[PDB]
């Protein structure tokens, strides 16, 4: 009985960590969320851009507007913080332990995403090769992500069923 | 906020579980000391012959 | 007879833990009137 | 555009099904939990004679 | 069963503000009757 | 599918390894008065008589 | 006019949620003191035997 | 949990205090709007003189 | 766990060294007929016979 008891304990610690877990991945999928639909915008008003009817004053206009939706991308990167912890800001893994003994971890990775890891390093429309490119490759780029996070979510939510139905049984 | 939630609020089936099982265990366990206040009286009928 | 445990409410309780998953999705759903709200839905579908 | 939409958007009258039938399990097993937690009175009755 | 965090009421209202700005946008673009009512919009085409 | 791109066969991939991480982590973790039940195949011996 | 609407004037969704979350706490709390108040009557047993 | 509200207050604060820029922002578009009629009435008018 | 920041780990040494000096007292402190049962290693002998 002292030794289900610690288990109990043990487990239901364990379930109340992984729901940590869930949320730093519902954040960090969020902040995803906004920096793809600034990439759209981006994708969109290259295409505006390269075009022969637009002059150079209009060309440094769309280029202000993909400049300042690049510095909203880079912005909303850096200070996206969660518990102290700026989760797109460095590449880095967290260990959620939903186990009662040691080593029960379940691995959750951050990718660094702003402009210098995306190719987007002075992206400019005006006095860049192949923009649309690279702008389709940031955007496949941070979808391999979003969907890592995705699986990771759908990993922790079936622990913590088990762990529920775990409990209960012992 | 919802992050918040998950980690403060309270469930409150398991809170009313856990508050009806209190219960129970408070009226048996004054059920019970009464029963054992009740014991000693048989020294009483010793004394008495 | 056991008034230390309550297995049984330990049952229901599991049962209405994981009922709760499919009222919020359906929720969320009509609400935002997407099948796909997030990468755990699809996210193959989400990247399409 | 309507290939996009046969992919990400979702049919209403599904949706609204599931919330139904989601809502009724709900209350149900609410309900279920209240009789559960009912169950161990009979202890009280056992203790008082 | 939170009583304190309405999270679902939190995201139908989020959906409701993001729905806003096409009602406003549409209404606004059919009152005036130029696609282009500000520099938000384009302001490429507006210099134009 | 035909339909599926090389970068959705990846996406679904990734989480099939992960689904099929987590069934060998329940596995090797699930263990019951220091038994690990769904580890190795064994028998117990349940004292039913006198 | 805009301006001062974004400022002043009230979002009637938020107003709506906090009222009928507002109201549920009050009824909670209703149910929860009525409880407690019940609650000290076992020493009135603990008296009676 | 301190740490959490601390952090939602803070957004809520933060989003009001954009809410007052991009007011300010549509003053002064509107403002331009108008000198931008009048310095096109100017250049019809510079038009008919020369 | 990974998702604890430096101070949330903090408190629960705080809490754990709390617990565990009250252990060592617990253990020190208890005395039955001014004997320290649960202080050294020894042994007691109950005479049961005539």
């Given amino acids: 009985a002292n030794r289900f008891t610690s288990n109990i304990k043990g487990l239901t610690q364990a379930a109340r960590n992984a729901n940590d877990g869930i949320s730093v991945a519902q954040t960090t999928e969020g902040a995803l969320s906004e920096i793809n639909n600034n990439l759209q915008r981006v994708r969109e008003l290259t295409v505006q851009a390269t075009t022969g009817t637009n002059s150079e004053s209009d060309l440094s206009s769309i280029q202000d507007e993909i400049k300042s939706r690049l510095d909203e991308i880079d912005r909303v990167s850096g200070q996206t913080q969660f518990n102290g912890v700026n989760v797109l800001a460095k590449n880095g893994s967290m260990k959620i332990q939903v186990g009662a003994n040691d080593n029960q971890t379940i691995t959750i990775d951050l990718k660094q995403i702003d402009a210098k890891t995306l190719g987007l390093d002075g992206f400019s429309v005006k006095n860049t090769t192949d923009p649309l490119k690279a702008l389709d490759d940031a955007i496949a780029s941070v979808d391999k992500f979003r969907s890592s996070l995705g699986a990771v979510q759908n990993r922790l939510d079936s622990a913590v069923t088990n762990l529920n139905n775990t409990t209960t049984n012992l | ?49 | 007879q056991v008034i230390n445990t309550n297995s049984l409410s330990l049952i229901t309780q599991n049962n209405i833990n994981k009922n709760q998953s499919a009222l919020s999705s359906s929720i969320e759903r009509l609400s935002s009137g997407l099948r796909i709200n997030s990468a755990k839905d699809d996210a193959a579908g989400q990247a399409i």
């Avoid at chain 2, 398991?14 to 265990?25: D, G, L, W, Y």
């Avoid at chain 2, 048996?28 to 008495?48: E, R, Y």
């Fill in chain 2, 1 to 49: 906020s919802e992050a918040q939630s998950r980690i403060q609020d309270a469930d409150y089936a398991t809170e009313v579980s856990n508050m009806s099982k209190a219960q129970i265990i408070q009226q048996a366990g004054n059920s019970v000391l009464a029963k054992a206040n009740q014991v000693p009286q048989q020294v009483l009928s010793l004394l008495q012959g």
